[PDB]
Amino acid sequence: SLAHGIIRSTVLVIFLAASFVGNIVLALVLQRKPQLLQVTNRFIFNLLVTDLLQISLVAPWVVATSVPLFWPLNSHFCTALVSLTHLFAFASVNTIVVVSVDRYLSIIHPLSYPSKMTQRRGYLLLYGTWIVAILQSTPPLYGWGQAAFDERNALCSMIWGASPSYTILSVVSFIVIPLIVMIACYSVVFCAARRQHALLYNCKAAKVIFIIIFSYVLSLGPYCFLAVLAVWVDVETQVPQWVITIIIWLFFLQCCIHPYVYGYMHKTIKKEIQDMLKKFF
Ligand SMILES: Cc1ccnc(NC(=S)Nc2cccc(C(F)(F)F)c2)c1
Ligand SMILES: Cc1ccnc(NC(=S)Nc2cccc(C(F)(F)F)c2)c1
Numbered sequence: 001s002l003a004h005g006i007i008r009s010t011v012l013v014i015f016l017a018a019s020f021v022g023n024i025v026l027a028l029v030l031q032r033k034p035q036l037l038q039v040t041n042r043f044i045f046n047l048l049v050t051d052l053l054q055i056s057l058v059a060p061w062v063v064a065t066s067v068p069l070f071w072p073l074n075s076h077f078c079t080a081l082v083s084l085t086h087l088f089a090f091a092s093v094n095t096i097v098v099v100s101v102d103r104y105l106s107i108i109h110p111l112s113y114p115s116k117m118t119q120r121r122g123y124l125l126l127y128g129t130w131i132v133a134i135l136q137s138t139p140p141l142y143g144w145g146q147a148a149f150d151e152r153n154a155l156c157s158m159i160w161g162a163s164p165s166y167t168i169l170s171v172v173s174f175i176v177i178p179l180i181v182m183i184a185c186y187s188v189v190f191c192a193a194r195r196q197h198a199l200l201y202n203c204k205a206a207k208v209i210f211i212i213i214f215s216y217v218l219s220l221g222p223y224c225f226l227a228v229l230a231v232w233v234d235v236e237t238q239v240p241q242w243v244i245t246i247i248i249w250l251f252f253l254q255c256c257i258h259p260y261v262y263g264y265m266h267k268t269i270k271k272e273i274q275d276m277l278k279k280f281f
Helices: 002-031 042-063 075-108 119-135 162-200 206-231 242-249 254-262 265-281
Strands: none
Touching: 002 042, 002 242, 002 254, 002 265, 042 075, 042 119, 042 254, 075 119, 075 162, 075 254, 119 162, 119 206, 162 206
16 A cells, blocks of 8 residues: 555665765775775676665665655556666666676685786676677667556566566566576685685684575575566466565665675775774774
8 A cells, every 4th residue: 555655665765875974985995995806896886886886776666656646657667667677777787797707716726816817807807797788688668578556565567578688678677597507606615615624624614605595595586586487377366466566675685785795704805894984983
């Protein structure tokens, strides 16, 4: 009902406001000293900026469409909004994959790491991930795929029951490839860590990997689950409101999840953040 949407809009603000300050603190700690690590600050800053841009260019419209005004709207509006949201999510996912690959290439082959990842390669990778996120995303602005308004949830989401090919492409580009790459890159790291632990001391390494995988799955899976289920059965009259509310709740949790998982778990970055926070407070 109206109260349910009001509650959803009210609770959608606190998470985003906390993520905003967390991302700003991370930005300050990462930009104060540019000569940090090696061809990594660029990747972390790219993830941070594609999180902040999504936050600031997505939150106002998503909150304002729930207010009981200008109900008619126009298909073009949410059509362009969903494209922006998908572009930002795809950029974040591709940066995530690149960061995971770099982490695996750093853990394994510790000797000839500098000769394989130069500044030119990092900049080319950043340009490539942005180009892919721009190009491969947003077909429906000109082709297959369409968004529409729903008088049940009124989120003006895209209907997957019209172009199965685009739904399949989004599904594979969302979960399959990133999950496979992450599992393949992390299994070897876990085996090497286990070995090193056995050599040194003649279960700690599994917690971090489990946390990363579980966080990514909890952030991204339900949306793909809903998209896959939409093709067979209807969604307007077959799904309760609370389920859609929880799905749209969990979709935006990645904004707060990413900085904690990838900035606060690093020892040096955590130390410097704590140092700055204690100095200011
Ligand atoms: C009237 C009514 C009917 C059903 N549930 C509630 N919510 C309650 S008691 N606490 C609550 C507050 C904010 C968020 C949540 C969350 F959904 F995140 F768990 C729960 C209220
Ligand atoms: C307060 C008020 C008074 C009069 N009209 C509106 N706008 C309406 S109904 N739809 C609308 C909203 C945003 C963009 C567009 C677009 F131009 F892109 F089609 C259309 C709002």
